[model samples]
Target chain A: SGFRKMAFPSGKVEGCMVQVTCGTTTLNGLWLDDVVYCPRHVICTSEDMLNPNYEDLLIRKSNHNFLVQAGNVQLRVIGHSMQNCVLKLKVDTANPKTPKYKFVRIQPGQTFSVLACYNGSPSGVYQCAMRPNFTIKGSFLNGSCGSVGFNIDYDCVSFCYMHHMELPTGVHAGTDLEGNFYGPFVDRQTAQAAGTDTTITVNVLAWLYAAVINGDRWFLNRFTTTLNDFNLVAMKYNYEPLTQDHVDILGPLSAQTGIAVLDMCASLKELLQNGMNGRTILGSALLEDEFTPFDVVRQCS
Target chain B: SGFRKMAFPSGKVEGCMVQVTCGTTTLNGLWLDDVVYCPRHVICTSEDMLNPNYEDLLIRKSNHNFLVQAGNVQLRVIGHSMQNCVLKLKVDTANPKTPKYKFVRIQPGQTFSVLACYNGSPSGVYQCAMRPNFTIKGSFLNGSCGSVGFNIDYDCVSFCYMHHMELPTGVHAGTDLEGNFYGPFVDRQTAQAAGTDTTITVNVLAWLYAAVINGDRWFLNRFTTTLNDFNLVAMKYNYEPLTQDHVDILGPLSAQTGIAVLDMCASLKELLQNGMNGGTILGSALLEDEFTPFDVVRQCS
Candidate 1:
């Protein structure tokens, strides 16, 4: 999937400056907004029924293909033009069992949206690259994208104790009267058969871990659970998944253990191989209080 | 004397919510203050002076009689105890004949410095009233310690000036000076030889016209020819030395005119009797360019 959203530090910190720096590592994050798709079938029609020489063609798809064609996507920013714009993109698939997310620095005014023709295949490996807009401050430049492939196994399941938990705002709990269960197994075979490797559960779990490591309670809430609900979740998963758990586990054990579990789950390349959709689990779990420190524990009397 | 100083409204008028109606008159303009004095001419030894006695036996002076005592003459603020207190006493003795003036107001906590003193002799007439422990809010209460008569003329001279030019720091301009003269002239030849009936030049002038016309500029400036040195002294002799040809002819003219000249002279009695010193003026004429519309004319441009 192409880059969708990004995150970066905003306020004052010990080592951060107001302006962007060169060679300085940026604590960055992002969201994948679009899915790769492909053509499933082709159809033909005749302009003149009696004349066989005149014909028009049309294509349709049963389900969107995970493969995305190259040089077909176009990224755009409002009020910005596409020219010699450049951006640096990176992905840490070093450990196939866990993937570390990163962002690309784009040149000013450069468009990065896909053209819909490229990037239409599933399980496609890709890496981020930058096009430094030497021609203009806010313009796009031509360059070949890069990629790196990996092999892994992954699985995920989405649950809200309710339905209608859509991708953005719809992922909230208690939306529908009935509960929801997406998937519990997203191994190599099942993901490839369905044109997706990673599952929703894995993504949510990874997101939650990231939020906790950086003390970002807000992102944790957004990714896994509601603010009030997440606090209780953190107390349950991090503090004591079972009420009879040891008292020593209640203090920091829950938080530390939960973080470790999430990091382990997010490292799976096969889990995120399905693009942004396959990473739903890691994202949703991150919103749960079970993975956040801003739960009742931190605010305990 | 050169025109070195002048008085103008501060343009800062204060208002009070407490209505001061007393019959048809109002006490709106009455400024209240206090006056204090010590006993007569007793010298203080070094040790005694170091620890001065605050309270001592009071002495009074009978009409034209002699009395000697010890004590200091001072004014104390109502709330602020005796410290470096100084009283400024102003009296108008403009008209030697029909000397009349009114007390403008007393500024509290002001001490009177000895201006001049003359030992007893035939031409002596000095009786100053005394009130002890006076406060700014309290009325003047003359006690049994009658009045004290000093053997001094009490005529004081002071200088003040104003510049017509704007000057930088440490700048000096044309050398011009003006003198303010204050005195008490008594009509001792009257039936009341003690001259106790001698009028106060300050009080009388403040009353005659000032008591009615609030917008009189001359009264505001307290400038009257009757207070002039030559005119004030001349009144004492009733223009006896009429050596000039005009004066020789005016003698018969004055008899025919009866009290017209005397009344005319008395009209300025308040300003003369009170002996309120006038301000001095300074500097040369303002430059033509300095005469801006706002400063050159009344009201704003």
Candidate 2:
């Protein structure tokens, strides 16, 4: 499998929330956070993990089933418990000809991973094939453990992309090889298709946020430094409003593309209701050339 | 003028974002924070401060204007600068009978406060009169300085309420007077209509968040400690999710209520698109008796 490591944003239409338990700790996958003794707060759920918008995964915090649905996903999961932890996963592929991936079980220290590359617009089932470490018939990621905190990693083509700022330094932007200052992803998305390792890392986060990815589905909120860093970044830099996507993503819900730039939680409705425009940090005047209608921010030709 | 110090969540429909310049310290309103030398991270903003969704107050990060807005409010402003700083503030009263409030300025060592008790719903004009140590015309909170950082406090009846949790102590909810666990706001809001000192301190943050109070407003996102604390509180306590408001408020844009309980920023549309329901923290089953058909979680009986 030619799975490559990359940055992503799991901002999609449908997804899942999984809660696993190991010995005394309830490890939410992203398993084995550096601190094996992490608190329950670190457990990733539907809100902050896979799909921030979808919370209909289960009904009991104690339910140990690892049921998740993601698009173009590259996921890594592990289980570690002072006590016994279990993982039983399955997959549901769009292609009927695809072999029935068997269900795989992971024990206390075992782990699992998957690569689901789906094609086709996000309408019904995806067209790409899913590759999991273990064979499974259905797309179910089930696990149980004492449940400590878990640190997970991987790339989901449809689920995510890079975090612009929130970094220890600042926005991902930096002086290009020429050092003349070139950033603001202009055409970064059009590459990833079925079976293609290529993906979009520079697109604005509008699509993910409109649907509330990594926000509520798992009940995890972001930190201030991580957020405020984004706003101030604008003050120090000058990207046309179009430089960032303030556009609304038309979908199951009205979404904004600039969550990455927000210093705080935003009201997508209030923000987009009046229609977003690039304005000076002080709110003086709208930036020249860019405007937000109902879609992603676009510069007027 | 009577100034009462109480807990509040600025959740009004229309408000202002203030950026105060204090010497090298761009002090924000909440004046002297405990950590006098705190990082720039502590400076509160409209998004995470006064009015989270409004970015119309000013345009220049260097601009020292303390422009803010609210309904029936109590505000405290301070100025701190490693360099020269000046403060000039004003207020707008809805009633013509109200006397003109004068403008007051603060040097590097002075302070200012205000008491505005209005009796009106969130219509364009607020009925409460504004009292500021320093004031001039229409609600302009102007200032200047070297710009380090500033913190502010006060209580706004129309623009606020209480956060259920996010505290080291979990939700504001507790076993009132009796140990029988009687929590949740049933009549909390009706008492907040104009002129009735009878305020709704217990109301869900639906109103404040619907309007994006203390959220994006000034480039501030809430911390996970504050947000996640609320969710886990439910696991330890027992309140029908209706106990929290998941309703959307109707105004310039669609606003949702249950922000206090959210561990992260929410997509008002996604969460409220199909409409929010009070499901078990595990999403196993919708809490019986109450349902979120848009305006707050209500008992369906």
How well does chain A score by TM in each candidate? 0.19, 0.18
Candidate 1 lDDT by residue in tens digits, A24-120: 2111111122211111011112222122221121112112211122223322211211111111212121212222222333321121111100111
For model 1 the local lDDT of residue B107 reads 18
The count of residue-pair clashes in candidate 2 stands at: 107
i-RMS for every candidate? 43.0, 24.4
Q: What would the per-residue lDDT of candidate 1 be over residues B77-115, giving only the tens digit for each residue?
A: 232111111111111211122111122221112111111
Q: Flag regions of model 1 displaced more than 4 Å.
A: A1-39, A43-202, A214-301, B1-301
TM-score, B chain alone, candidates in order: 0.17, 0.18
Identify the CAPRI category of the predicted complex in candidate 1.
incorrect
Across residues B1-301, which tens digit of lDDT does each residue of candidate 2 receive?
A: 0011111111211123233232322422211111111112123343433322112222222323332222325222333222111223333323222221222222111111111112211101111111111111111111211111111232221211111111111112111111111122221112211111111211223332322431332211354333344434433333212223322222212324233333222332223223335322211222111111221211100
How far does residue A207 in candidate 1 sit from its true spot (Å)?
1.2
TM-score of each: 0.13, 0.18
At residue B91, what lDDT does model 1 achieve? 19
